[PDB]
Design a binder for these strands. Structure first.
Lengths: 143, 53, 119, 138, 70
RNA sequence: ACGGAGCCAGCGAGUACAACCUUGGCCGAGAGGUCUGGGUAAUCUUGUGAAACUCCGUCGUGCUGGGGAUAGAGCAUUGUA
């Protein structure tokens, strides 16, 4: 057949990936969990509280798969959104850098992300295995 | 001759100036022109600017 | 007998030390504005003024107020070396007197005069 | 059900039902993101109404309200910091806070500064143009 | 506050009594009777989807239509 | 409205005698610190993956979690200030 990541829907892909990590609990935790705003502009903290990081780390991994090499500053700009800066028009500014950096640092040691040339972070050989296994698992859930 | 006869004028509106006379208001600094907006309409086609649309 | 009122100061313990801690020790114990300002080079800022304030207390007539050290430089912060002497703040219409105290610490000279005549 | 409605906490009112955070916001000092930070230490559901609680949770919270640096807070989610000569930080979250600000406002009036002079008359302090704003005054 | 939001065990008896056999079942419908106002109606409706009882039509947040299980 | 998840444009602009735009990597709950570049520019910033939107959850018709004004303390940055 043709087992790839694109057959599985993008929103439904992360649900199987999140539960996969919480069984092991070996993706590592930084220390800033639930002492967190999430972005530079966001009144309420995370509603999920527990889990949470495993949803974030899964969505970072799948975006590193599709593209050549993703960085810290771009991920902050991608996740980040609108504000409410008093009685002015709503602007756009980057999200939390410390959360998205320790995703990339921790996933290196677990065995997903690799150090690429020029600049950014590409995928390892063993990283492509775990992405496809969960994609194959999600294919079994649908079919 | 006297000691104090200047201010740190490396920025702002006072230091910057046009080429013709030296007006400190309505200064075009785009593309390093330094010609104020009254005289730019006079010398538009000589430089090469035209009102196409 | 020991405590008369309370310590007049910045943030924490006691007054006594402030009289003998010139500028560098005072800058450590301060907010973001004074630290960032004093980190940069102060040339002819505490050079001309402090020679008068110290010399005025030598010329003073014992226990009474020293002479008034008039100031155009009203951007200066009240460091604790000259707690006792008077300073003349320039609005435009005459150098207005301001008596320095250990209460009035961590503030500018200009705010104890005001340049508009109503209120 | 219906276990207690007011329900005091450091003299101020904490209304029954509603929620954990939004009932605690009634205190003159606690807000919409501090009570969540305080609830995180004790670990209680925001889903619940919160007026109907166990007795130990109220007393555990009040200890965290009084003492900042002892319990798990970074020490930069505090209301007030730095007072007197050379030393430490502390805050308050009750009728202590409203009384503290009145005493702290007197410090500005005693030293007599550009703010303290403006607070006497009831005019705008933060460099605004008063050619429009607030046509009523107090 | 117009009442009917506070959690009572006496009401939880009467929710299961009036649950079965109805055309319209939603967050829009239950609040008209002065039941658990607002969000606690959504939690009450979430119970009735677990063990059959009332089956769904739409599955959106803010538009949650249900119909009785024939 | 408040959370995650999904994730798409086009007009422009930009230093070498100055201090311009500045990805990638570490420090930081932020703002911003720093090491490095690349770019005199369909070559590097840059695909300027910008918003509103999409879709599941949290609140639900109470000046309310809507709304953000007045206020106080400190941590940053640009500057002789």
């Amino acid at each position: 057949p043709g087992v790839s990541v694109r057959d599985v829907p993008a929103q439904d892909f992360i649900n199987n990936y999140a539960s996969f990590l919480q069984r092991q609990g070996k993706l590592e935790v930084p220390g800033y969990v639930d002492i967190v705003k999430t972005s530079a502009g966001n009144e309420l903290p995370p509603q999920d509280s527990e889990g949470w990081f495993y949803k974030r780390a899964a969505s970072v991994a799948r975006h590193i798969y599709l593209r050549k090499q993703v960085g810290v500053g771009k991920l902050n700009k991608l996740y980040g959104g609108a504000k409410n800066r008093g009685v002015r028009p709503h602007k756009h500014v980057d999200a939390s850098g410390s959360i998205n950096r320790k995703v990339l640092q921790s996933l290196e040691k677990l065995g997903v992300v690799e150090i690429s040339p020029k600049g950014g972070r590409r995928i390892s050989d063993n990283g492509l295995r775990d992405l496809d296994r969960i994609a194959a698992a999600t294919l079994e859930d649908e079919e | 001759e006297n000691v104090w006869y200047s201010h740190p004028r490396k920025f702002g509106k006072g230091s910057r100036q046009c080429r013709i006379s030296g007006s400190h208001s309505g200064l075009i600094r785009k593309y390093g022109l330094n010609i104020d907006r009254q005289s730019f309409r006079e010398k538009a086609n000589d430089i090469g600017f035209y009102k196409y649309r | 007998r020991k405590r008369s009122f309370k310590t007049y100061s910045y943030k924490g313990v006691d007054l006594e030390k402030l009289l003998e801690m010139p500028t560098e020790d005072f800058v450590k114990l301060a907010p973001a504005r004074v630290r960032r300002k004093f980190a940069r080079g102060l040339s002819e800022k505490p050079a001309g003024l402090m020679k008068k304030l110290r010399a005025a207390k030598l010329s003073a007539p014992e226990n009474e107020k020293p002479a008034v050290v008039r100031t155009h430089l009203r951007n200066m912060i009240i460091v604790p070396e000259m707690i006792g002497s008077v300073v003349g703040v320039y609005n435009g219409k005459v150098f207005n007197q301001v008596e320095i105290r250990p209460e009035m610490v961590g503030h500018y000279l200009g705010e104890f005069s005001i340049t508009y005549t109503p209120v | 059900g219906s276990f207690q409605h007011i329900l005091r906490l450091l003299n101020t009112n904490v209304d029954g039902n509603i929620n954990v955070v939004y009932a605690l916001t009634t205190i003159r000092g606690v807000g919409r993101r501090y009570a969540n930070l305080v609830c995180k230490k004790a670990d209680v559901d925001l889903h619940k109404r919160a007026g109907e609680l166990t007795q130990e949770e109220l007393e555990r919270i009040v200890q965290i309200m009084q003492n900042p640096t002892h319990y798990k807070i970074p020490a930069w989610f505090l209301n007030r910091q730095k007072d007197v000569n050379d030393g430490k930080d502390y805050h308050s979250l009750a009728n202590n806070l409203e009384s503290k600000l009145r005493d702290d406002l007197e410090r500005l009036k005693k030293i007599r500064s550009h703010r303290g002079i403006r607070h006497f008359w009831g005019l705008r302090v933060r460099g605004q143009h008063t050619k429009t704003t607030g046509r009523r005054r107090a | 506050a117009k009442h009917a939001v506070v959690l009572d065990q006496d009401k939880f008896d009467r929710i299961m009594k009036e649950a079965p056999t109805y055309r319209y079942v939603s967050v829009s419908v239950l609040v008209d009777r002065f039941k658990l106002g607002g969000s606690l109606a959504r939690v009450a409706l979430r119970h009735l989807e677990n063990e059959g009882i009332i089956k769904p039509v739409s599955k959106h947040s803010k538009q949650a239509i249900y119909t009785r299980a024939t």
